[PDB]
Design a protein around this ligand. Structure first.
Ligand code: 9UM
Ligand code: MG
Ligand code: MG
Ligand code: MG
Ligand code: ZN
Ligand code: ZN
Ligand code: ZN
Ligand code: ZN
Ligand code: ZN
Ligand code: ZN
Length: 308
């Protein structure tokens, strides 16, 4: 069998409370969070059940993906390597370990289904530049996979279950909000297809689920002076309610693939704050995490990228 590195990339999460400072310092481009912000972040991680389970999920996704890929075909033996953006093991650490282990050929995938120049493209550029610095190693990189039918089907089935679980009047008066992580609006000056891909995710999921009333929103924007992609899910929820009085809101943060603060808090608390305030029911179906259906979707994405 041909041996191939499987480079699984993701944002990264702190591994313990004491990593919060350095993690967010990395996110803030060297700017250490002020003490009140550090304390608030600790409170938030404690409120959603703790950091450790969150940090486990990328590991489980990569290892299940490796094993499942090695099981469903017989030509390639994959070895998974995790490269993270904002905490060790960094992308360059992962590429360097692949080089050390004798890997000469690798396929990479970012655990984010939509391409953007800010995230996926930069992950891929960092991996490929480390590989070319070290030499003797090439990487073929998945760039987007939001339209993989098995992944669409994951979210379609979750949405169908959520709508079927509703009371009749909720089911008749509900709103589906499909969201991804906001980015600076300036990405549009490069023709970044990220917004169009999020809209396409929302179209495909709503269509598959039979949900005719849905909206596209953004979440987790930063505070840079430049405008970020909007509307934010909080404002969009309040605004849609003020237009049409929906009694239930279903949040599908399709841009995220795992439980993390920006879902468990930014949706299950902040959006929940808004729905509770307007008297609407809140629903947020399970994130893919390392569930077998999602891992099979990722394995299909990888094998298709390799033309197998
Ligand atoms: C950490 C992280 C995740 C998971 C994600 O989707 N995004 C973004 O879009 C940014 C900008 C960052 C950071 N992250
Ligand atoms: Mg301790
Ligand atoms: Mg494509
Ligand atoms: Mg926020
Ligand atoms: Zn980032
Ligand atoms: Zn591992
Ligand atoms: Zn399997
Ligand atoms: Zn070397
Ligand atoms: Zn739109
Ligand atoms: Zn963020």
């Amino acid at each position: 069998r041909k041996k191939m590195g499987l480079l699984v990339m993701a944002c990264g999460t702190p591994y313990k409370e004491e990593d919060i400072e350095r993690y967010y310092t990395h996110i803030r481009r060297g700017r250490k969070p002020e003490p009140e912000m550090l304390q608030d972040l600790k409170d938030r991680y404690e409120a959603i059940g703790g950091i450790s389970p969150l940090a486990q999920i990328t590991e489980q996704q990569a290892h299940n993906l490796e094993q499942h890929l090695n099981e469903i075909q017989d030509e390639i033996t994959f070895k998974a390597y995790i490269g993270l953006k904002h905490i060790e093991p960094f992308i360059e650490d992962a590429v360097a370990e692949m080089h050390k282990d004798g890997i000469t050929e690798a396929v990479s995938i970012v655990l984010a289904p939509h391409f953007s120049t800010f995230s996926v493209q930069s992950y891929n550029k960092r991996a490929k530049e480390e590989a070319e610095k070290l030499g003797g190693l090439t990487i073929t990189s998945v760039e987007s996979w939001y339209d993989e039918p098995k992944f669409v089907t994951y979210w379609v089935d979750r949405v169908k279950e959520t709508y079927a679980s509703m009371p009749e009047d909720e089911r008749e008066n509900a709103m589906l909000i499909v969201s991804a992580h906001s980015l600076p609006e300036k990405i549009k000056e490069f023709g970044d297809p990220y917004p169009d891909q999020l809209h396409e995710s929302a179209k495909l999921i709503a269509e598959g689920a039979g949900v005719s009333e849905y909206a596209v929103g953004w979440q987790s924007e930063g505070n840079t002076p430049d405008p970020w992609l909007g509307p934010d899910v909080q404002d969009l929820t309040r605004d849609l309610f003020e237009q049409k009085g929906y009694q239930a809101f279903v949040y599908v943060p399709v841009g995220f693939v795992a439980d993390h603060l920006e879902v468990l808090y930014d949706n299950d608390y902040e959006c929940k704050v808004v729905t509770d305030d307007i008297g609407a029911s809140y629903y947020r179906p399970e994130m893919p995490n390392a569930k077998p259906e999602f891992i099979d979707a990722l394995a299909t994405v990888v094998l298709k990228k390799l033309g197998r």
